[PDB]
């Protein structure tokens, strides 16, 4: 998706590519300070976007996510609000 020997080439355009495996494998085959940290910053944002995309892809096959905590109540007068412990909801 980019070349490691140049940090100036990473950005949202190239990091949109795929899952974090591509990021990590790209960084694996490598061979002033403002450049590298700006690069670190967008790399962080890119890997977060990659991770949320991975979760979307895997969550298309999972159960719905309930609200964990009670006490946030709008139609409270009818039902008493009760949270849910997310102890295990695997599928």
């Amino acid at each position: 998706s980019f070349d490691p020997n140049n940090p100036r080439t990473i950005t949202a355009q190239t990091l949109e590519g795929a899952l974090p495996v591509d990021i990590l494998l790209r960084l694996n085959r490598a061979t002033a300070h403002a450049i590298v940290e700006d690069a670190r910053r967008t790399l962080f944002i890119g890997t977060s976007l990659a991770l949320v995309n991975l979760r979307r892809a895997h969550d298309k096959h999972l159960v719905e996510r309930q609200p964990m905590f009670a006490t946030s109540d709008y139609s409270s007068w009818a039902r008493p609000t009760v949270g849910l412990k997310r102890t295990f909801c695997p599928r």
Binding site: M68, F69, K85, R86, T87, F88
Partner: protein, 246 residues
């Protein structure tokens, strides 16, 4: 609580400046908060020409030798008398070179009586006095907690999970499944505890998981560690006469 005359009677001597480490606090500009340790460690050997006294106390008896330089400054059971530079605290991060002075500061706690005048034996004996028929820790619980605290290959992933949770509430009821799996794995691995380093975590464990996904011989540890702190909290409640907010 009358030490006004003692200070006026002590400063008549010129100075006895031996060091400056243990009696000087400096404020720091909000610079780096990770590099402040860098700037401090590099300067540290420059602050200790000779050994700081408070660090290594004199001895059990040699404090009462007819010539040492510590009896001159231990003359009240409820105060501390030392030497510190002539500045107003806090001060600059670079330590100054001003001729010293003799300050005073009350021991807020009885535990701050130096060991030469309150031997560890008496302290342990008083504790064992208070410890009878109040509440205890079954040997199974303490064998686990000490094994945990004494481990030298503690899995770093637990520290990572601690730093990422940072004692919130939403994140713990989010990560409950992973935390339970980690605790179960470690218990069936080495028969110790986990997350005992943090307190909010050991609270959340027994207030959320508790009767649920943890084993009946693993939750006992996390309930004991809380009931003991509860007994400790209750302790001071019966050593106070009912008085008025002063």
């Amino acid at each position: 609580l009358d030490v006004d005359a003692t200070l006026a009677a002590l400063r008549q001597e010129p100075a006895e400046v031996q060091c400056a480490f243990g009696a000087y606090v400096a404020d720091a500009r909000p610079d780096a908060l990770v590099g402040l340790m860098q700037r401090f460690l590099e300067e540290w050997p420059g602050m200790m020409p000779v050994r700081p006294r408070w660090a290594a106390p004199a001895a059990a008896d040699q404090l009462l030798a007819p010539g040492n330089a510590d009896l001159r400054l231990e003359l009240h059971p409820a105060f501390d008398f030392f030497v510190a530079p002539e500045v107003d605290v806090p001060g600059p991060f670079a330590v100054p070179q001003v001729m010293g002075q003799v300050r005073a500061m009350p021991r807020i706690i009885n535990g701050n009586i130096p060991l030469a005048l309150c031997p560890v034996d008496f302290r342990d004996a008083r504790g064992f006095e208070l410890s009878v028929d109040r509440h205890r820790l079954a040997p199974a619980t303490v064998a686990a907690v000490r094994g945990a605290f004494r481990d030298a290959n503690y899995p770093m992933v637990f520290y990572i999970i601690e730093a990422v949770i940072h004692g919130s509430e939403r994140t713990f009821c989010a990560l409950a499944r992973l935390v339970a799996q980690c605790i179960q794995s470690y218990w069936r691995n080495t028969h110790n505890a986990a997350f005992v380093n943090n307190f909010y975590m050991v609270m959340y464990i027994n207030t959320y998981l508790g009767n649920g996904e943890l084993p009946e011989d693993c939750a006992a540890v996390y309930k004991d560690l809380l009931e003991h702190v509860h007994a400790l909290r209750r302790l001071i409640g019966e050593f106070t006469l009912p008085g008025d907010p002063l």
